[PDB]
Amino acid sequence: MTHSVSPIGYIRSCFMEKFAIPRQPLLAPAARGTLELLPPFDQVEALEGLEQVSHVWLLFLFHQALLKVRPLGVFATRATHRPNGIGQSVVRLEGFEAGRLWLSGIDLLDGTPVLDIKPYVPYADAVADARNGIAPPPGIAVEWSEQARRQAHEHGQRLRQPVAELIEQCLAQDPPEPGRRYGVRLWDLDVHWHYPRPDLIRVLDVAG
Amino acid sequence: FELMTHSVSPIGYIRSCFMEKFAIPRQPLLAPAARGTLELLPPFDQVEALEGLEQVSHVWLLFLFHQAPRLKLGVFATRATHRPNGIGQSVVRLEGFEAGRLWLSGIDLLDGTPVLDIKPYVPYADAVADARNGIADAPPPGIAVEWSEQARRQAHEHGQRLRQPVAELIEQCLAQDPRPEPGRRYGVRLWDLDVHWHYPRPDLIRVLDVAG
Numbered sequence: 001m002t003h004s005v006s007p008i009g010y011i012r013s014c015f016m017e018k019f020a021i022p023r024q025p026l027l028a029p030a031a032r033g034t035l036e037l038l039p040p041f042d043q044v045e046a047l048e049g050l051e052q053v054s055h056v057w058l059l060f061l062f063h064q065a066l067l068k069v070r071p072l073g074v075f076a077t078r079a080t081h082r083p084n085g086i087g088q089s090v091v092r093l094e095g096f097e098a099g100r101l102w103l104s105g106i107d108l109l110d111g112t113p114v115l116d117i118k119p120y121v122p123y124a125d126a127v128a129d130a131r132n133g134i135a136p137p138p139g140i141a142v143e144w145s146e147q148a149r150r151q152a153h154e155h156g157q158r159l160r161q162p163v164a165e166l167i168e169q170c171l172a173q174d175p176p177e178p179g180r181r182y183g184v185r186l187w188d189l190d191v192h193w194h195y196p197r198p199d200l201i202r203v204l205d206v207a208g
Numbered sequence: 209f210e211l212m213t214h215s216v217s218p219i220g221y222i223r224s225c226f227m228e229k230f231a232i233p234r235q236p237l238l239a240p241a242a243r244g245t246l247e248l249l250p251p252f253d254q255v256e257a258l259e260g261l262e263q264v265s266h267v268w269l270l271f272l273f274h275q276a277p278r279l280k281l282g283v284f285a286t287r288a289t290h291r292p293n294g295i296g297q298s299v300v301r302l303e304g305f306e307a308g309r310l311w312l313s314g315i316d317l318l319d320g321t322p323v324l325d326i327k328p329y330v331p332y333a334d335a336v337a338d339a340r341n342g343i344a345d346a347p348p349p350g351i352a353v354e355w356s357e358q359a360r361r362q363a364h365e366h367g368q369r370l371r372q373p374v375a376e377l378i379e380q381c382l383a384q385d386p387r388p389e390p391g392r393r394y395g396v397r398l399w400d401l402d403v404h405w406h407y408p409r410p411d412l413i414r415v416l417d418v419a420g
């Protein structure tokens with residue numbers, strides 16, 4: 001049996017690469033994006049009622065995932081290389097209009113094709129008795145060079161995004177060598193940082 | 209300007225107590241007797257693909273609504289079964305597994321459901337404590353259930369024959385109130401059984417008969 005699916009829309013995302021995408025995205029509220037809905041579902045009628053829903057599940061295609069074991073069985077993990085290649089994420093819904101959802105705390109790559117939107121239903125989706133021994137790091141302290149703080153603010157005004165907060169929230173989640181400069185792309189920016197101490201990240205510069 | 213298309217195929221099929229949509233409990237995880245298996249098709253029937261699930265109590269299943277608009281109120285504000293791309297998402301309790309079989313508890317899946325994916329439930333990522341949903345179906349309040357001596361005898365006899373908790377499943381689905389009328393007869397199919405009941409009072413279900 002084969003079943004054909006097609007995207008209802010595509011993600012526009014802060015994240016351009018898989019590296020600094022936080023392992024706990026709901027602790028990164030500055031990780032924002034939009035879901036641009038495709039012409040059939042771009043009518044506000046398809047969204048009515050979501051004004052009373054804070055979080056939504058997105059089923060999507062791992063389009064940048066280019067598999068039965070993972071060095072752990074594939075079905076015991078959330079690996080991106082898996083049969084049928086469908087991902088599942090719960091993100092916070094900040095608002096919506098005809099043909100667009102505003103999202104926060106996302107873990108989705110830019111351009112991600114979305115297959116479905118489901119409202120998060122707490123009594124059904126939040127399993128209090130759930131345990132998982134296979135499944136997080138506490139988080140590293142983040143410090144700013146004075147130059148980078150000014151640059152994050154300027155680009156935050158230009159992009160109308162919480163750039164400084166996003167940089168801090170992704171670096172704090174431990175995306176190892178002293179002296180070496182590291183980098184990541186966020187929106188249209190290149191962010192550089194280093195490890196002055198093994199337990200401290202310092203943001204060097206924000207360019208774009 | 210052309211629509212992207214992606215082909216998916218089942219990794220396996222669900223074998224389920226439930227044969228019809230009626231009386232499937234609204235809160236399936238409070239119905240541990242709602243049991244079923246996922247029969248995995250090759251090459252996904254190898255024990256290697258399951259290693260580690262011994263440490264995971266609950267799993268997500270992505271599946272096809274194989275038993276078949278935007279108005280439903282909006283389709284994306286609901287968990288309706290008729291939806292674009294026709295993919296369902298349920299979290300079930302994982303009781304155990306072997307090569308090519310998962311034992312599931314608290315399912316809400318129809319028999320024969322084609323499953324597309326298995327994901328481990330990850331509490332820090334999947335359990336949103338601050339989540340709110342006003343448009344959701346409120347969890348069922350609960351109705352009282354009483355048994356005819358005949359129906360309880362048959363339910364336990366069929367429970368031994370089927371080697372399933374038939375009586376427990378009956379009680380757990382009826383206690384969540386499938387939904388009036390007083391002289392009308394209602395039923396639900398469980399495995400190969402037909403269970404019959406009625407409402408002697410508006411707040412009381414009486415199980416009448418179990419046939420099969």
Ligand SMILES: Nc1ncnc2c1ncn2[C@@H]1O[C@H](CSCC[C@H](N)C(=O)O)[C@@H](O)[C@H]1O
Pocket residue numbers: 017018019021022061062063064065078080086087088089090107108109111112113327
């Ligand atoms: N469109 C995409 N294609 C491939 N990988 C993606 C992707 N979008 C996000 N990812 C990856 O998904 C990784 C975390 S897991 C995200 C998938 C989903 N949360 C699930 O549990 O199924 C992210 O860190 C990122 O590396």
Ligand SMILES: Nc1ncnc2c1ncn2[C@@H]1O[C@H](CSCC[C@H](N)C(=O)O)[C@@H](O)[C@H]1O
Pocket residue numbers: 229232233272273274275276287288289295296297298299316317318320321322
């Ligand atoms: N295989 C199937 N095909 C069509 N409907 C199904 C089905 N399996 C279960 N259902 C229906 O799905 C209802 C549960 S709600 C929808 C399924 C899933 N929990 C989700 O949230 O996406 C069941 O009570 C039954 O009415």
